[PDB]
Amino acid sequence: DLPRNIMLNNDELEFEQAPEFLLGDGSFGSVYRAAYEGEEVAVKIFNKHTSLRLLRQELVVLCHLHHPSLISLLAAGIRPRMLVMELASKGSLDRLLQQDKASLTRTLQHRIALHVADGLRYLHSAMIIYRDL
Amino acid sequence: FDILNSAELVCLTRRILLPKNVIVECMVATHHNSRNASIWLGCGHTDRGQLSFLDLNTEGYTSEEVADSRILCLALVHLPVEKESWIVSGTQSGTLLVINTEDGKKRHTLEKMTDSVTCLYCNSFQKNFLLVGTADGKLAIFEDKTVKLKGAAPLKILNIGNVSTPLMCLSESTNSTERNVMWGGCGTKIFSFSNDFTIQKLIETRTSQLFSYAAFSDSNIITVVVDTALYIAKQNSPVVEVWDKKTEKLCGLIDCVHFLREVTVKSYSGRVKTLCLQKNTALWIGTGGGHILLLDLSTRRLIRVIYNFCNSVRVMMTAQLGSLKNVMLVLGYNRKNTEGTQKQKEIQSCLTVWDINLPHEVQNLEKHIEVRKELAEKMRRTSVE
Amino acid sequence: VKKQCFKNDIHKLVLAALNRFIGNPGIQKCGLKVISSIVHFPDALEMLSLEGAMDSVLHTLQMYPDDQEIQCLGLSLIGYLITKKNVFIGTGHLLAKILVSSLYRFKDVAEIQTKGFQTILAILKLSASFSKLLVHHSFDLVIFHQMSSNIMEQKDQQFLNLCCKCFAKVAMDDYLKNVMLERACDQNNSIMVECLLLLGADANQAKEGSSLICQVCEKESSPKLVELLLNSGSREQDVRKALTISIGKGDSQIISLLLRRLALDVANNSICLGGFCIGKVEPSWLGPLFPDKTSNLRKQTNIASTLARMVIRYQMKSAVEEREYITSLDLSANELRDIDALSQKCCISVHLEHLEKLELHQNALTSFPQQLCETLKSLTHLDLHSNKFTSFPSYLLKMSCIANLD
Numbered sequence: 001d002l003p004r005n006i007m008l009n010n011d012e013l014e015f016e017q018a019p020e021f022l023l024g025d026g027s028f029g030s031v032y033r034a035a036y037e038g039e040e041v042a043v044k045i046f047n048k049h050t051s052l053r054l055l056r057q058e059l060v061v062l063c064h065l066h067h068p069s070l071i072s073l074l075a076a077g078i079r080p081r082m083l084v085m086e087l088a089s090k091g092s093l094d095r096l097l098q099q100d101k102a103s104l105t106r107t108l109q110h111r112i113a114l115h116v117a118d119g120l121r122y123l124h125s126a127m128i129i130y131r132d133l
Numbered sequence: 134f135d136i137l138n139s140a141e142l143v144c145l146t147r148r149i150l151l152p153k154n155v156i157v158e159c160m161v162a163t164h165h166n167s168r169n170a171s172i173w174l175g176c177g178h179t180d181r182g183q184l185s186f187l188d189l190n191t192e193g194y195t196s197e198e199v200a201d202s203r204i205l206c207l208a209l210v211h212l213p214v215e216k217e218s219w220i221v222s223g224t225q226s227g228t229l230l231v232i233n234t235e236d237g238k239k240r241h242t243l244e245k246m247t248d249s250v251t252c253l254y255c256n257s258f259q260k261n262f263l264l265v266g267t268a269d270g271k272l273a274i275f276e277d278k279t280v281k282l283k284g285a286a287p288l289k290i291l292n293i294g295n296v297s298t299p300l301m302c303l304s305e306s307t308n309s310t311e312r313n314v315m316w317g318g319c320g321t322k323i324f325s326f327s328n329d330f331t332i333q334k335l336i337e338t339r340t341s342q343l344f345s346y347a348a349f350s351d352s353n354i355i356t357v358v359v360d361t362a363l364y365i366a367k368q369n370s371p372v373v374e375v376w377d378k379k380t381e382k383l384c385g386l387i388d389c390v391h392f393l394r395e396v397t398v399k400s401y402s403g404r405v406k407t408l409c410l411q412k413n414t415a416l417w418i419g420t421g422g423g424h425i426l427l428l429d430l431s432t433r434r435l436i437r438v439i440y441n442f443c444n445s446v447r448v449m450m451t452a453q454l455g456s457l458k459n460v461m462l463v464l465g466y467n468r469k470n471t472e473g474t475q476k477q478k479e480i481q482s483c484l485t486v487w488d489i490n491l492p493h494e495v496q497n498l499e500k501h502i503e504v505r506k507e508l509a510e511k512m513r514r515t516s517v518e
Numbered sequence: 519v520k521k522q523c524f525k526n527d528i529h530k531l532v533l534a535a536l537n538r539f540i541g542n543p544g545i546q547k548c549g550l551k552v553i554s555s556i557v558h559f560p561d562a563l564e565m566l567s568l569e570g571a572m573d574s575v576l577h578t579l580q581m582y583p584d585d586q587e588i589q590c591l592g593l594s595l596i597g598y599l600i601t602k603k604n605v606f607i608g609t610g611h612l613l614a615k616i617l618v619s620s621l622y623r624f625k626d627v628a629e630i631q632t633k634g635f636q637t638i639l640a641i642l643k644l645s646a647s648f649s650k651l652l653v654h655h656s657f658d659l660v661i662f663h664q665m666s667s668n669i670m671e672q673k674d675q676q677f678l679n680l681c682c683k684c685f686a687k688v689a690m691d692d693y694l695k696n697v698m699l700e701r702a703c704d705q706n707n708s709i710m711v712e713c714l715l716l717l718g719a720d721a722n723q724a725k726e727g728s729s730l731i732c733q734v735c736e737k738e739s740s741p742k743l744v745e746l747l748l749n750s751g752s753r754e755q756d757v758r759k760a761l762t763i764s765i766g767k768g769d770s771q772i773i774s775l776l777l778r779r780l781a782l783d784v785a786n787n788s789i790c791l792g793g794f795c796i797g798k799v800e801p802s803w804l805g806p807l808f809p810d811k812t813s814n815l816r817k818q819t820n821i822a823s824t825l826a827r828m829v830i831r832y833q834m835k836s837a838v839e840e841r842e843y844i845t846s847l848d849l850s851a852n853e854l855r856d857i858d859a860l861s862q863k864c865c866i867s868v869h870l871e872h873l874e875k876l877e878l879h880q881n882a883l884t885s886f887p888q889q890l891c892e893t894l895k896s897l898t899h900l901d902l903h904s905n906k907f908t909s910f911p912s913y914l915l916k917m918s919c920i921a922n923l924d
């Protein structure tokens with residue numbers, strides 16, 4: 001029931017589940033660096049005690065809403081129940097706050113706050129709450 | 134600055150010159166994405182087919198004469214069971230050799246077709262089929278699982294046309310993963326088929342409604358690529374036809390000579406010797422004059438014309454090398470006139486490697502230049518006042 | 519001795535000598551002669567093909583268009599060393615270009631044409647697709663001129679048979695026949711259009727050319743060419759459009775020939791020139807429409823019939839091997855502000871004393887002429903209403919035998 005441009009092609013997915021490739025944890029899954037169609041992507045795989053409802057909860061925002069302040073989904077599989085989304089070049093904000101608290105010029109802080117606010121305003125104008133910021 | 138002000142300089146990753154005086158007609162890429170990035174080439178400089186192996190990371194060329202007649206086309210078959218890999222050849226005589234990608238002593242021929250084998254396109258519908266297109270308008274469907282046998286027969290020998298009409302235009306559809314209909318071409322007619330192997334459409338193309346470009350519209354079809362419509366190129370045809378897959382009529386007719394006229398002024402044999410279509414960005418036309426036409430796939434726009442690197446483009450195809458995809462392998466014939474003006478055989482076949490991001494960088498770079506220009510003007514104005 | 523000479527690498531040496539040195543045409547003549555002597559050796563073909571002599575011959579023909587001996591030797595040679603590889607997958611455009619150019623430039627030289635047509639037949643024996651290329655690169659001019667000239671000039675049965683065989687193998691496809699018919703109709707070549715119609719090539723092939731009759735009428739064609747199209751299948755609407763065009767460019771013979779089909783019923787000796795809204799009437803236009811039994815049918819153009827029969831024979835061989843005065847003159851819907859042209863004496867006045875009825879209703883006539891009504895001596899049914907008359911002529915009753923005046 002989803003656009004046909006988001007279906008995985010397992011022949012073009014170079015994915016290696018290992019702690020060395022871990023990027024971060026999530027609400028109900030873990031994300032690993034991988035390659036999809038010859039590009040660096042991030043694959044989120046869910047847990048053993050999960051269901052399709054969590055995947056569709058991801059997809060109700062990741063498949064119908066497009067915005068420069070929201071992460072982009074490239075593919076969404078069913079057989080292993082994973083998501084394939086973009087890869088952030090500079091990582092999460094937690095690493096910047098903890099490890100690299102020297103590039104946080106006030107212009108960068110203002111841009112980050114403005115982009116997060118724009119994403120929130122789009123989400124809230126699209127009948128959707130986020131609840132985890 | 135003008136040489137550095139080009140996207141051809143940023144997105145031309147590698148350029149390989151083959152040994153002296155070799156005429157390679159077809160190429161395929163050994164692409165398991167993890168096994169070995171390399172190229173297989175079918176030479177045609179002699180009337181005795183040679184298969185040559187090009188190791189890309191070492192630029193190592195190793196040729197081998199195995200076919201009585203020149204190899205016309207090549208295909209790579211990968212059977213996931215037992216991690217089997219093979220390559221199948223199509224010779225002008227009609228034979229069909231099969232040699233292992235890894236093993237070198239696994240030669241075993243197959244059924245000798247009636248005439249020359251002009252296509253060997255392989256794809257999976259699920260079940261994998263190795264489609265054999267004989268030069269007599271005959272698509273001899275063959276079974277991938279049967280390639281192990283030393284000599285076999287086609288599963289279903291389809292007939293599309295007579296001997297006068299050649300079948301040399303196999304293709305598939307990459308839109309919405311519609312791996313059901315594989316639009317081909319026999320003679321001057323476009324045929325379609327499915328896993329039922331029933332011709333859903335057989336459309337005649339030799340007639341031109343305008344009847345003016347019919348000189349270039351009454352030639353055998355050479356290549357077809359389909360994203361949302363049909364793109365048709367013919368022998369010695371400076372025109373490309375954009376046909377509708379529903380109304381079965383010519384929607385558009387793009388003139389390659391019209392786009393080349395801006396660069397030639399500064400009998401036009403601007404043929405279309407190959408044609409490749411990038412996913413959703415642009416259309417890559419390969420001309421017989423050494424030019425490469427990047428057209429905007431959106432409606433009509435010409436992104437760029439690339440020349441002064443080859444004398445004639447022969448084979449253009451998309452590969453993936455060393456977990457770095459997005460490389461448009463382009464093979465050209467650089468024929469220097471040093472030997473003589475009578476077109477004496479001094480031909481360097483150059484296998485250059487591009488980056489199919491190239492349609493993007495053009496706009497990127499030009500925007501850059503515009504911005505800098507503006508800045509310059511602003512600074513000069515601030516200098517005057 | 520021949521095998522020993524071949525093993526001495528004679529072919530490589532002579533090809534290198536005549537290829538590396540493109541100047542000094544004498545060495546070119548010598549090299550072509552030597553190759554011609556070489557080809558009929560027992561083993562010549564394979565080594566000659568491997569060395570690539572064919573490209574050398576084609577280049578030699580390209581650089582020497584005007585010389586006669588080079589052209590003759592090359593055209594004789596090309597058919598001798600032609601192989602399936604040289605025309606592989608239907609590609610042979612330089613071949614067709616050079617052959618047609620050579621044949622066209624030297625049209626009167628019998629030997630050059632004979633060698634060229636033998637070479638062309640030899641090539642067609644290999645791949646039938648080549649004919650398409652020939653049609654594309656204006657082989658029509660050479661074919662048509664040769665078939666006309668051979669009949670007009672000295673008769674050579676072998677040469678005519680060769681030309682007809684080549685034409686038959688060219689005209690296998692219906693589309694090719696249509697293309698040749700259209701191109702022959704473009705030129706004033708009525709001698710052969712009859713033959714092409716006999717072969718096939720339906721005359722209702724509208725692809726921006728609209729109506730063939732109309733387009734041939736525009737380019738000041740001969741009457742016999744229009745006659746062939748009219749006799750064969752032609753839609754009525756196209757004929758009427760051609761009639762309007764020929765009214766625009768006034769020509770007596772074409773207009774008469776068109777009206778001979780549009781409005782004439784010889785079975786009921788009646789003219790039905792009704793709704794064909796011609797703005798005027800002239801004696802010359804409907805002159806030949808009268809029977810004129812003194813003129814009789816003449817069949818002197820038997821050339822087209824013989825050529826068509828020979829072509830059909832070759833095609834099937836290949837297939838199996840492998841008083842009565844016309845008295846109802848009607849001009850009713852015609853916009854006719856005047857009919858004064860019929861008043862003046864002409865060929866019409868020879869046959870008007872028998873008209874026996876005339877229809878002129880629904881026009882714009884005024885004051886029916888005195889001379890015309892004094893000419894018709896048997897008009898027994900004259901109706902003319904919905905015109906712009908203003909007074910009864912009163913001399914219409916001076917005619918010999920008139921009834922049913924309306």
Ligand SMILES: Nc1ncnc2c1ncn2[C@@H]1O[C@H](COP(=O)(O)OP(=O)(O)OP(=O)(O)O)[C@@H](O)[C@H]1O
Nearest residue numbers: 023024025026031042071086087088089090091092
């Ligand atoms: N140098 C780096 N290059 C790439 N990714 C990095 C780098 N350093 C850290 N990362 C991690 O890679 C991921 C890139 O963001 P991504 O689009 O994958 O988000 P995500 O997986 O949806 O996020 P989350 O883990 O919060 O659910 C982040 O988890 C980030 O912490």
